[PDB]
Amino acid sequence: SRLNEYQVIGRNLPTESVPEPKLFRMRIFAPNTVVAKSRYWYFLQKLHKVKKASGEIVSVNIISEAKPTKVKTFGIWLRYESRSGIHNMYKEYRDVTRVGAVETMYQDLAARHRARFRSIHILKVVELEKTDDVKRQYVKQFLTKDLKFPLPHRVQKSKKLFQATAPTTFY
Amino acid sequence: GRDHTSKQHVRSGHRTAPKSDNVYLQLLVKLYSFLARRTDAPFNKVILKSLFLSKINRPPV
Amino acid sequence: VLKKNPLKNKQVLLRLNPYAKAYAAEKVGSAKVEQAKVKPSKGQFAEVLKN
Amino acid sequence: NTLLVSGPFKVNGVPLRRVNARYVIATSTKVNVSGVDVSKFNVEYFAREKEIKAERVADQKSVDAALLSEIKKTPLLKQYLAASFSLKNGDRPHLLKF
Amino acid sequence: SSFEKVVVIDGKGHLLGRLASIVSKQILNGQKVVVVRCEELNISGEFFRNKLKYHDYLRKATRYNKKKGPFHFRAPSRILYKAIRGMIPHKTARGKAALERLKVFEGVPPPYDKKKRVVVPQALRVLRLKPGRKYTTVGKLSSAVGWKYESVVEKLEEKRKVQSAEYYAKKKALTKKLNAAKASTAESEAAQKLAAFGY
Amino acid sequence: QKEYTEAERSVIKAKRDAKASNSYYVDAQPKLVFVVRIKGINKIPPKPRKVLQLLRLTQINAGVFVRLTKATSELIKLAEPYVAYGYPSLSTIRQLVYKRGFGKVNKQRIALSDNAIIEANLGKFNILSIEDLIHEIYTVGPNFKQVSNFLWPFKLSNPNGGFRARKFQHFIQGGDTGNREQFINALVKQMN
Amino acid sequence: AESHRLYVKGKHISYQRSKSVTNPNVSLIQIEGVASPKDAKFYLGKRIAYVYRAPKEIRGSKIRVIWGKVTRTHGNNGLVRANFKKNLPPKTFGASVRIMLYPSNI
RNA sequence: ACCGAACGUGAAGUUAAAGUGCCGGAAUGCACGCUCAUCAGACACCACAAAAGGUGUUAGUUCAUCUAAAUGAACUAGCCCUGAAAAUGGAUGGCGCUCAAGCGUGCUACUUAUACUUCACCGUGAUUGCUGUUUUGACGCUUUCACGAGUAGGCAGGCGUGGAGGUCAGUGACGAAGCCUU
RNA sequence: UUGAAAGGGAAGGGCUUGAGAUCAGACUUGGUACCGGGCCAGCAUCGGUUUGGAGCGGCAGGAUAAUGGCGGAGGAAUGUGGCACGGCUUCUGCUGUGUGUUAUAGCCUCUGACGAUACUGCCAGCCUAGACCGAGGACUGCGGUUUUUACCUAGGAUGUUGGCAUAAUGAUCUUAAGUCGCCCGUCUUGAAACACGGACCAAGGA
């Protein structure tokens, strides 16, 4: 629920020399539209030599998942900043939406690399259509034949402070 | 809290009554206070404020 | 002597806004909109999905 | 604003009297009293003026007659009315249906 | 979550601090608590590490007079008591009254040997710790730092368990007999009417 | 009421027509903001302090309506880390004026409890009722200046539900200050 | 029968307080069997009696009562805030109170 | 001296910063991971640590040998370990905590300041009106609104003491004044 | 000295309530058995403020949601049935590898006409659970229902009932409990200071 995927379309303000400026689109993963347009201007100012004051947002639109109940494996390409430099990396996630995999990626780079949201650029998110496009074993092990596994040591969550029967963990 | 734009609890700084204790001056002030309150003629308001003035603010004519 | 909220007191609402009676009696708050079923995005705009 | 109740007095020991609706729990059990004559019971009937006036005894008999007539149609209803109510250990009034 | 006259807790397999915080809040709210089998309490972390921690505790003593210093109690119930007292405003009269509502024991002495013992799921080690982690038994730690009565408690606990198993065998026999009696009077009119009501 | 609905339907129609004709409809930029001071009165540098005084924002949780131009935009730019602002909807304006609407009559805060009070002070500008005043605010009319200055600064409560964990950083970075652009209405519903 | 109770058991837990300052005018009350704000809202507006014994008889009785009422829930675990005619004395932290079933809305 | 917020006397509501295992008001709340330390770690200012090492574990980058069943090399950076020695016994505030009550991140609710909102009352400053009813108080009465921190210091309105002019044809040996007193 | 009370390495203070003691009041300067009043409370309805409910309903927008379901076309493998080869099976989920495309399971992509749901917003829509407050004191105003110079929820609380007046009710004193509270004065950037004066009291004292 943290994030949505938006398209943001913008251009330069029309002038006499350039009456029909080119339209540029970006795919932005943001909590809301304010942050979405902010990210769009951030990236346009880094790539091209355009500022917010001389441009305008043309369109902001939710991009919904095509198949929100189909299990997918995603590849994500990232540029992130560590404490000591700038690095590119590629990771894989399993989810039913692109936004879900992106939220997991943000949690994952927070957990393993101490990489905050401000320190990550999402280069590309791709649905991996073939089992041969899946590279990482930590997701590849969930794509095997007749997958099954137990859940040992079930801890039941009680509504009372004191229990009159011995604890059990069967399941 | 308030970010006060002006100084708080400021008296107007204009005399609202004679400092004099003369009873007959106060009778005149009573008359012209009624007149200034009930007539909207500027002359009466001017006369009312003049009765409040101190001695150096009423030079002899 | 007492401020009464027009959003709460109906009499104060009608004292300030006479049209509130017409708005309520004409069900303006839940008025239907007549139009046709259309899908104007089915062409190029579907580039929201991929460029 | 008060409520007119009766035990019936023969069943409970509580007579025709007034109670306040905020000091009562209304249950799900219903008795058809459509044939009970309670027309003349008003505020002045319980007006203040020990021994009970004979008219009050007569009216208690009259109302309890039809009341007991309808009550026995429901099995165990009479014994339910004869028994007091109390909260046992583990009874949660917020979770209970009456 | 009912208000009880006394709550008797089997300390076996409970983690020290979690049980301590729960019991502290219980006694502070006017609930009487008894904890038995404090020798069977658990502390997370390997035995050597908790032994080092207790030795760090032992090192602290009033320099100018050792008899005024912190008093280091070695018995497992006193280890639990130290944990609990640190979670109580024990220097107030209300805190002393709360601590007067608590009783802690090695083993299960009378009259608690014939009373119901309960567990606290939020403090139970098998439910709280990740399966691979190491933990300490408080009885073993107490012996290593000077508690003298581990074998006495073990012997008395063996005797109590024999007696309790005899009790349970008798109870189980009567329960089976009563179950047979209830099944015999099944398919009765009252029983069917009860089954309609959920009972 | 008719022209509000006609304005809404026409914008919807123009967006739908742009999708059909392979175009994009860009909404008219907002002309109105509602600015709430969410910072106390201590430790404010002189220039934003003066700016906040000029916006009549001299207490925490005071709110004013500002017509957007380059001049006022740079004014609000200066006060950005001390205010929360956005674009108020019609219903938000109506709720603010109805519940916490007060008029400046002879330097006195006077409740807008009768249309006579509004008409005796803004009648010369063709404002005769509370709905005229709300209309003049919402559609930034020729006499926005007089109507908005006649309105005493709105004295809001703290939000029911609180703020985000930390207020004093921009809305974009998870704080509460700056422009939030339609979410000012949710904040005002919390605070009104 | 063996039981005659028509009230719900409760305890006087604490005053309304921050870390260092207490507010005796508001008491925090634990209702037996109530573990969520959803279940506690049944008891809002119900009357509360703290019943205690005193050395000197009044109208022949040594039993004295302090009356209050439930005002709102407190926290997430089903505690409630209560308002008594006289603030409950702090020595009763941990003492039993009686939550009445009236004013009833069942 | 930092963060929040500046203060008349109160009621109700809501918050800020900071928090919610116990001490302590508020979740042993929901969630994805990382970490096991025979000196773990635990929150700005702030009560320090470096160069340099580790085949502890985790995730990544770039090459290479592979069915003519995976594996090898260099490297990057997270937590952990080593580097890390002082004098009374002792400090993540204490207890204690290990799928945390630790570290990174997301979320839901919840707790409470002399702050904010509405109301009451006090004062200050302004403000409406008041003579054929102004009538023995117009230095009065009355309508409405805003505001209230303070050393040095200024001013205003008052309280108390000895004595003096005037007045109450005042009190008092049937007890003045003084003194003691839930 | 007597009486009362309290007391685990000071005592004292503020706030709050309990307990014990003391004080106070309306049955009035009450009116002629009744009328009428004082105090404390229950309930009802209203007004102001405010917190809730697994709330209920109407409407709008978006890819005029995306999905799903149904119909149609195309494809593939973590390949179903079938078939061919095997180690363990008297094929008693036995079993693995192959081939290939719906068969004795299914899946994916595109799409055609309908129908919903989430998300966001609007309702001068409805129902429902609690808390705190009641300033003012003939009328005058704005509105509303119009049945009418009438009535109203509309320029700030009333109705009704019980109990008590040898009393609940309030205030102070002592004490217990909870929480907070360093020794004043002074010089000073900075004082509780291991800075200075101060054992106590009266009268004098700038």
Ligand SMILES: CN[C@@H]1[C@@H](O)[C@@H](O[C@@H]2[C@@H](O)[C@H](O[C@H]3O[C@H]([C@@H](C)O)[C@@H](O)[C@H](O)[C@H]3N)[C@@H](N)C[C@H]2N)OC[C@]1(C)O
């Ligand atoms: C990520 N930066 C880390 C910073 O977090 C910190 O790291 C400490 C490290 O110094 C500690 O380790 C150090 O300090 C401890 C003790 C003094 O706490 C010593 O026992 C130990 O020998 C010593 N190496 C280690 N136990 C925890 C890390 N987070 O120290 C600086 C640093 C290494 O740059």
